[PDB]
Design a protein around this ligand. Structure first.
Ligand SMILES: *[C@H](C)[C@H]1/C(=C/c2[nH]c(/C=C3N=C(/C=C4\NC(=O)C(CC)=C4C)C(C)=C\3CCC(=O)O)c(CCC(=O)O)c2C)NC(=O)[C@@H]1C
Ligand SMILES: *[C@H](C)[C@H]1/C(=C/c2[nH]c(/C=C3N=C(/C=C4\NC(=O)C(CC)=C4C)C(C)=C\3CCC(=O)O)c(CCC(=O)O)c2C)NC(=O)[C@@H]1C
Ligand SMILES: [K+]
Ligand SMILES: [K+]
Lengths: 158, 162
């Protein structure tokens, strides 16, 4: 879903047309479209930079972790996940909501990682590392939106 | 439901990819259309009862369906019919705003062909009335926005034929 979907489904539940408030939200949202796309492009072209620089800070911060146990596959797996969370965050920025991130990445996160036997706090940590890298690649304003999505993932992991 | 954005996100997500150059900008296309979409939804919202009145007048009245034994005979059945046209208009507006037809497939056409046949609701008359709604709305918003709402109306009509 997206901000647009949320507005529509709201009206749907009251069996009516969009209200003045729902229309204004929509107009303010689409007005920020070009900027949103600029941000998502940043993330796209800097996936490897963010992941590798963040992995690097992360592992220094946390040496006891299953991606740093001299196990490739495990290391590869964790690096892949970081890339996926970037992709999801980028989708969320475009969508104007954490819905994309929620549906694809957040709902079930504790159950999956718990099953895989990966400590949750370590994932939170790595998210901080990834968060920093990405913020640095972008303006002050651009950083606001993106920050909250990274925060969201970290919220759901605790 | 899925919107113009959600759709592009989902087509990307199944191949594990970031939005591609064409998925982007199709997005720009959409974001640019929002004003017209908000304009259209506002106007339809303010002429909703009026649109269905004209729609009914041009396709369903003075026919065998409003005669005793007809499916639109009995004020209850007449009112049911008008309620369904209310639903087509509102949901087509939701769709247009979303820029995706998916909401029609899931909230309007799910079991409708089947439900109608079960109840004896004439399908050819219903399609006729949907094509009138198209024109009535085009007469209210112009051909430019009329084409857009048209696509959603055509969708509903098409999904009754099957
Ligand atoms: C990296 C920061 C941390 C880490 C993670 C870790 N991941 C795996 C294995 C998998 N991770 C996933 C994750 C996902 N599946 C999904 O659908 C989503 C959402 C889109 C994600 C993010 C999956 C499914 C796997 C299993 C392998 C597979 O892809 O089929 C491992 C390996 C575990 C193992 O025993 O093999 C690891 C280590 N590890 C760390 O140290 C960090 C804290
Ligand atoms: C009007 C253009 C035509 C017409 C309509 C007709 N419809 C019914 C019965 C039903 N209509 C629906 C449709 C929906 N209900 C929903 O919630 C949705 C999604 C938002 C839709 C699209 C359903 C489920 C029914 C059954 C429930 C009910 O009876 O209210 C009737 C009544 C038929 C009867 O015999 O009771 C009628 C008259 N009929 C015409 O002649 C027009 C061509
Ligand atoms: K969970
Ligand atoms: K009116």
């Amino acid at each position: 879903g997206s901000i647009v979907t949320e507005l529509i489904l709201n009206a749907d539940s009251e069996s009516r047309y969009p209200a003045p408030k729902e229309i204004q939200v929509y107009q303010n949202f689409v007005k920020t479209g070009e900027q949103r796309i600029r941000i998502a492009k940043i993330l796209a072209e800097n996936e490897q930079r963010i992941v590798q620089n963040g992995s690097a800070r992360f592992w220094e911060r946390v040496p006891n972790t299953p991606s740093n146990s001299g196990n490739e596959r495990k290391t590869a797996s964790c690096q892949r996940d970081q890339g996926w969370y970037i992709r999801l965050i980028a989708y969320s920025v475009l969508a104007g909501s954490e819905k994309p991130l929620e549906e694809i990445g957040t709902i079930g996160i504790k159950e999956m990682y718990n099953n895989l036997e990966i400590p949750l706090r370590n994932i939170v940590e790595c998210m901080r590392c990834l968060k920093e890298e990405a913020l640095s690649l972008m303006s002050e304003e651009d950083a606001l939106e993106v920050s909250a999505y990274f925060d969201y993932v970290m919220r759901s992991l605790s | 439901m899925q919107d113009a954005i959600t759709a592009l996100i989902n087509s990307s997500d199944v191949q594990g990819r970031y939005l591609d150059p064409s998925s982007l900008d199709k997005l720009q296309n959409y974001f640019q259309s929002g004003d017209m979409r908000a304009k259209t939804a506002i106007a339809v919202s303010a002429n909703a009862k009026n649109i269905v009145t004209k729609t009914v007048a041009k396709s369903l009245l003075y026919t065998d369906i409003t005669a005793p034994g007809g499916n639109m005979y009995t004020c209850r059945r007449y009112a049911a019919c008008v309620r369904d046209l209310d639903y087509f208009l509102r949901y087509a507006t939701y769709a247009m705003l979303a820029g995706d037809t998916s909401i029609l497939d899931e909230r309007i056409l799910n079991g409708l062909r089947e439900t109608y046949n079960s109840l004896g609701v004439p399908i050819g008359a219903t399609i006729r009335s949907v094509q009138a709604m198209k024109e009535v709305v085009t007469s209210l918003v112009g051909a430019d926005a009329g084409r857009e709402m048209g696509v959603y109306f055509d969708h509903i009509a098409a999904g009754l034929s099957l």
